[PDB]
Amino acid sequence: DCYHGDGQSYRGSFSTTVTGRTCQSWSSMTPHWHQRTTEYYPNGGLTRNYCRNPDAEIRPWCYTMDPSVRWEYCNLTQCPVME
Fold it and tell me: Where does the Kringle domain lie?
């Protein structure tokens, strides 16, 4: 799977970080409390624990299930140019 540009439009199901950690559910406040929820980002597609870029980051990211690592970029690369 892959994303385009900075990934704001990414709506795939990838959920693993660049270090192999699993993404935290956007509706959960554990292990990390945050405000990136569907209520505050109704158009961000914050579903399950899927990698997303609801803000203005460089690529899709997610809070992680490791209490010691709050958030990380996901292990996704940009889609190649359509030939």
Answer: 1-79
